[PDB]
Amino acid sequence: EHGHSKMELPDYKQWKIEGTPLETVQEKLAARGLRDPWGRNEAWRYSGGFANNVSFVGALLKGFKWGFAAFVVAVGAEYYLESQ
Amino acid sequence: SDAPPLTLEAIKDRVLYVLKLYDKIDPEKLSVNSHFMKDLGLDSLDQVEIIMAMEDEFGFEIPDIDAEKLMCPQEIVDYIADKKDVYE
Amino acid sequence: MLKIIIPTTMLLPMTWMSKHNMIWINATVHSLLISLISLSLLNQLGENSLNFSLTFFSDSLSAPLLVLTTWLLPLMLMASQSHLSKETTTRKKLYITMLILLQLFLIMTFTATELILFYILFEATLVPTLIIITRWGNQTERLNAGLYFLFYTLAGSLPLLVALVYIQNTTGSLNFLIIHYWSHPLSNSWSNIFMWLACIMAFMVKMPLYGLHLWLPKAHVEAPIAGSMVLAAVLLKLGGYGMMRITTILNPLTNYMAYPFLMLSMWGMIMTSSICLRQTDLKSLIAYSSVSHMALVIVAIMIQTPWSFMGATALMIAHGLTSSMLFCLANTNYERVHSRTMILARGLQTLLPLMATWWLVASLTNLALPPSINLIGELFIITASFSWSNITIILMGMNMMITALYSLYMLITTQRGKYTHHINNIKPSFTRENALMALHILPLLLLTLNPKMILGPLY
Amino acid sequence: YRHSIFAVTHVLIPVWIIHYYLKYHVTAKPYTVVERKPRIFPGDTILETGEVIPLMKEFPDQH
Amino acid sequence: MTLCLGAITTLFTALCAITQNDIKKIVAFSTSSQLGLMMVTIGINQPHLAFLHICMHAFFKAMLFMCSGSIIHSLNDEQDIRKMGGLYKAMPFTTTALIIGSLALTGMPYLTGFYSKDLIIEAVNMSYTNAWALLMTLIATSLTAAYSTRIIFFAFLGKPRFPPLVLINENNPLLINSIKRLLIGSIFAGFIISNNIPPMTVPNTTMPLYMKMTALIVT
Amino acid sequence: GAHLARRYLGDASKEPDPLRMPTFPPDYGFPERKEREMVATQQEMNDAQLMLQQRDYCAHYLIQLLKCKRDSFPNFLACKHEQHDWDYCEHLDYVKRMKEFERERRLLQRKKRREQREAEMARG
Amino acid sequence: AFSAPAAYLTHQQKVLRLYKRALRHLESWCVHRDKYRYFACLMRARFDEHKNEKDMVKATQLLRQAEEEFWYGQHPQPYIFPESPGGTSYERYECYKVPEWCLDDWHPSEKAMYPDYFAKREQWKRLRRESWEREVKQLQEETPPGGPRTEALPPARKEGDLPPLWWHIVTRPRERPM
Amino acid sequence: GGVHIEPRYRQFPQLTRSQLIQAEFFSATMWFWILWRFWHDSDAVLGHFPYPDPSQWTDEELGILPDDED
Amino acid sequence: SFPKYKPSRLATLPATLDPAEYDISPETRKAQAERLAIRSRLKREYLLQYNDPNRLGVIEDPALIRWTYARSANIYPNFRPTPKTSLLGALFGIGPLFFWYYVFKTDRDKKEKLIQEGKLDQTFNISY
Amino acid sequence: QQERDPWYDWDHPDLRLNWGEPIHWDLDMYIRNRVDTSPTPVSWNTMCKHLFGFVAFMLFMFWVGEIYPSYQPVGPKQYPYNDLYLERGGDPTKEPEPVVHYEI
Amino acid sequence: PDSWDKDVYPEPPRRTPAPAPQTSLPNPVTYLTKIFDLLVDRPVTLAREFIEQQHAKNRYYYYHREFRRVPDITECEEKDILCMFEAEMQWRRDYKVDQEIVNIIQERLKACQQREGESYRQNCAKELEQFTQVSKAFQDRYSDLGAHYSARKCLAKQKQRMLAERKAAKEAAAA
Amino acid sequence: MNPFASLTLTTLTILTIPIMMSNSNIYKTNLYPNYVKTTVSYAFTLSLVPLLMFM
């Protein structure tokens, strides 16, 4: 049992430099009369599920919302049970 | 590991995929047997960059003595196949 | 004691009247039976000794050496079976005769109750070894090797004989029991100094002491495999046994006569160990490691304390077994490759895995991994030396580190890495070789369970 | 089932052998198994004797 | 001698770890610095605290190494952090496990590393000891936070920098369960063990407010 | 900490030496000098076998806390009042040590001031 | 690796080797892809500003200052592919490589398993046995007198011939045998 | 002993809902535990016993005389 | 300009920093060509011996034999007693012995004097 | 042997040696498992200076911190029964000089 | 256990506290010990009873060997080899017995240190004092004799010690 | 009697059984890693009891 499923490559025309930091790199290079020939080779790194980033603080607070809600519920139950 | 057993068709497809993203060469003109200097009008620095892109794509390094004489996509595919022991 | 001596003598007619194709089988079986019989000597007392007769006696210092001597003969026969295949029947019988005569001389030497008798057999052990080295040795250096092994020995032992007869004209006896019970102090005098030197140098040269050790690498690298086994396992310990016996009449001179040798040993063990770091021959490396271990034994005997003597006995037994195993492994490589150079045959763990396991166990034992009896002897000697002077630890400590290094070096060069491409004649290991290694290594790990058997008479 | 045989052959048999060896051979000799003395606090009572350890000196308690 | 050896060890190893690019090397230098901190604790005559730190470090350092090995296997035996980019979303369980382990290593309050590291820092702060060793311990704590940040930032937060053939896969029950047991350990074991052991030292009940917060501030 | 700066950058003799403290008689300040009271006796403190460093003036609270810990075993958070009591007693011990430090420092200040006034009167 | 080396490297080969090394180390310094793209385009622009120069002396004066500048700023810990000579898995599978001739020493009870494999192996052995006798003479007549000048080997030129010295290249163990 | 996931080649890899929910659950567990412990045991961080001011103690309790007696 | 690299015994000069590779002369090219020629001859000999189906033995290497012989057995016949060898032998073989003798003798004299004066405190020293 | 070309087809790839070529007198000293002489990014003298300076500075600073320790503004810890005379060593037949502790 | 003499290996009365549960939570330790008893102690005890009854079916004895006293080295002539042999054997037996006495005292000391817990420094004074005395006596008797020790060398050491003591006593008396 | 010592020795002893079985048939199959893992888990569970006794 191994992975022989005939994976097919996506279309190469899909990758475009627009909307990526590679576009800004191209603009800075054109400010000096240069060009980036390999730009479209890296575009897939900013295209799909990789298009959105998370901050360091956001990474640390990965499950803070649900934990905070559970803590509020638990402390409310503790208050409503002790006060009896 | 769990690495799928890549084939000659996969190697050729990936080589052509990387070459078609090189905006210096026209995707209509190139083929498997299209030469680098004469058929596509490229330089030696362009060939070095193409070899580096191949190395980045396939995750292994081609030594310079071997890399300097790989002038077609077909010979790139053959080199990768011989290095990685591809049957079909 | 004749219950062991007579069957060993009967080995000779049994060998000579045997069939042409049955010499090895009969010799091995009856040598194993003699070893089983000699196992009964291990029942010792905390009292004086096992004084069988006026001529022979046994002690808990002599019993383990006798057991090792009787056990080594079948292993030597197994090791010699291979390279003596194309030899005529008469010469094979002569080889077995030399081995039997060596065993007989050693047996008697360990149990002799008289110093002169001990000297005669201690020298009689030379002739079979010299014949074995110079007749069935492989290279042309063997002749020179033999000469060295002879003259060094004799150069040390001719003065001893003189001293011995001198002693018998003064005390009236050379019997060891009387000598022990009637011991008298040695006054500090030039005559006494030279008597001390005469009594000590013959045993120093056969340990061998550093600076007097030049014969040993020659003899061990030029000898056949059985000769190397018997030289490293038993013949080196003759000097230790002799010094243990004779130091009872040398006090209190040893308190200050021991200084030149102690230094020569304590520094020497460093040098030889470092020599093992840069060696291109396996047998030469194993021989130099033997020199280092015997330097430690020399220190133990010169310190003259109970812990020193216990450690020296244990280390003698352990080194005998370990060095014999290492020589057998090197020879099993040589018979395939015919070179005796460390870096020729490489990456052998891939081609011979079980032999690689044997190599690992032998290297671990030579490295003195606890609780092996090698480490027991080493640690007892080190503790006694620390009591002698706290500074000694430095040198001792250094030796330990160096030893491990070269041991693992020998294991890594031959077993690990990539195999040599052009060497395509490495056949699977035979049952004979595997059984040889197993019969070397199982007694060591069994002896670690009852160390009191090999701790000598001061336990 | 496999867990049952594993628990029988790899836990129960070794613990039986070790408990027998400790209870009937090791403790047959003195000082082989030496226990740290149990701690005694005021107000405790002893099974062997039955006396009551006196309480402390009623220290002034506040906060 | 033990105090000075531990202090110099922890400082030097954290300093070396701060610029490493192999992830296993970073974790190994972290282990060495933690061992130096243990020796510092021994030097100030707090052996039971050192034992407690050993017990907590076991949990969270082993789980950190397992997360690193998971990443290495998922990226085709690639160990350099230059060649791993956005893994926060690509493999979430490893991300949460490594985040919790890094928080436990840096002494986040009420986690497993809190109950040993915070007490060790307090004990070194209030003791008759070398000023240099104390300063080196504090700087080493800061550097511990720094290299944990380095691992997280270069392994999980950016854009992907691995080869195009994506073989990322976490879905193996063996890996998940093995990581999860030590995750639960590195969350609760400090509390359980600290509350279930007898007191073996005099506590540091009263302290200046800035001295009580020093570990958190430097982290 | 500021006392380190005061002793190491300022006048060393102006501040106490922690190793050689105290240097002044206990009765120098006021003659009352009430003695410290110990509750746990030698025998029960040996029977509880605390430690030679836990065998201090707060040992009775430690003994009570250990009794609670042993008695309510499965509920490891059952007895927290006695933990608080032991911690409070240790806090009071530390405050007494701080008071000793301060008293020695002020006595050193006053002794040096006496020496300066006497030197001024002698020079005048 | 596969290609035979020459007696020396020309100026062009040295320049290209510097270009590859400098780009790799710049990538090791610039971790992110867009930063690397920008600085690699800048390095390409810096590299070909002297592309059209004609004289050898100054062109060699360049590529010397370039080597010195590279060695000053060479990133002491550059990225290495894991299988490359400095990588973390360089010779990892070297211990699983076993030579083919070991199969000749298998017990008949072992060769009884896999009969088809050993039949094919016998076919290969007989092919090698004939081809060797042809190859020795082919190499003998194709070599210049005085010995070879370069360790490059010729192909087969006849119909049934095989390339000389082919056995130990064709029967390589594998890249990942186990 | 897992399930089959094919490679993607330059696209985000396929994810199971199980691993997502497990990771979110464990992160939420860690944060809830931290919040609960801070709510219940706050003295472990901020301290319980105030630090006295040494200069604020009166000379009466420190045994200091007005620089004339002894 | 950039700070210069200074080679040492244990950190040698890079090939890209060798001025000798930038001083190209026809004689240098001829030397390189003939070095490659002799390497190619040796490689051809080895590969002819290595690919031979008939051969079933370790290939003998004269260079390895020369190395082992030079390291072991060619030493003494080429030894000549010179001031340098004599001085180095005397130092390296005699100095350590007397150094360690002095150290150990001083230590044991100190210990013996302490024992004779009775101020050593050998309590519990039972095993020696 | 470590600075030999790793991309060449050596006859002995692990040792990076060719059959028939002269062997260095000290080959066993340089076998890639032992001392190597490969060029380093930083010069040997600079590395030696930096390492020695760091070690010497750390030793000097540890000695300085030994002379200038850190402590808290407290007096010595007080122990009840003659500074635990009986529990620390003992000798209960000597009647030690009593040490009494000051309550403030 | 009757297998050893309680006076030679003394032990304190071993007073242990009584269970005083303070809460209603059942502790797992008691239940674990009950299941341990049921699952381990009973079968082991039954096997032991079977083996003990089998041993009782076949009862036989062995004895401690008693040794007569012989004249010591202090009453042997210079060259009378038989008397020196007997005295040497007797001295060696006495040496072994003294070694075992030291071993017994050391075992006492180690057991005390383990048993007393945190108060071992004060509660093991008697064992330390006994070991100090026995160690001093053993060191006086047998230290520095060497590997080739004998009764004659021990007698010489004792004679030199007595000469030194007599000289010191005469010097102190004639002070 | 006092299961503490028996439990403590049993943990270390049953840690050694797979080493003895390393020459048996289980070592030549693919169930050996699970065998060792199960043995270690059982040893952990057993060793949890003397910790409870000390606690």
Ligand SMILES: CCCCCCCCCCCCCCCCC[C@@H](O)O[C@H](CO[C@H](O)CCCCCCCCCCCCCCC)COP(=O)(O)OCC[N+](C)(C)C
């Ligand atoms: C070569 C590889 C190693 C081989 C083995 C080497 C081991 C043998 C070393 C010999 C041991 C030492 C021999 C003598 C030691 C006695 C102590 C004496 O030499 O020291 C001083 C002696 O002073 C001088 O040494 C006098 C002798 C000087 C002449 C001797 C030659 C010195 C170096 C020779 C070395 C050659 C060795 C190799 C020979 C081939 C003490 O002063 P003094 O109190 O008055 O004499 C005490 C002795 N009494 C009581 C009998 C009187």
Ligand SMILES: CCCCCCCC/C=C\CCCCCCCC(=O)O[C@H](COC(=O)CCCCCCC/C=C/CCCCCCCC)COP(=O)(O)OCCN
């Ligand atoms: C590996 C090579 C080692 C070579 C052997 C080294 C040992 C040499 C030992 C000395 C040799 C002769 C020993 C004498 C035999 C002992 C007998 C004895 O001690 O009697 C002495 C006699 O002692 C001597 O005569 C010895 C004199 C020496 C003469 C021979 C010189 C040999 C070389 C000496 C220097 C070398 C010794 C050490 C060598 C170290 C190793 C190289 C007392 O004689 P009396 O006159 O009866 O009593 C005195 C009261 N009237």
Ligand SMILES: *OP(=O)(O)OCC(C)(C)[C@@H](O)C(=O)NCCC(=O)NCCSC(=O)CCCCCCCCCCC
């Ligand atoms: O057509 P091709 O065969 O590809 O030929 C290419 C090229 C013509 C450029 C070249 O091979 C050639 O033959 N040039 C002739 C002249 C010449 O090249 N002279 C030397 C120029 S040196 C140079 O390019 C400047 C180097 C600047 C970069 C320094 C690197 C520092 C990096 C530091 C680490 C990050």
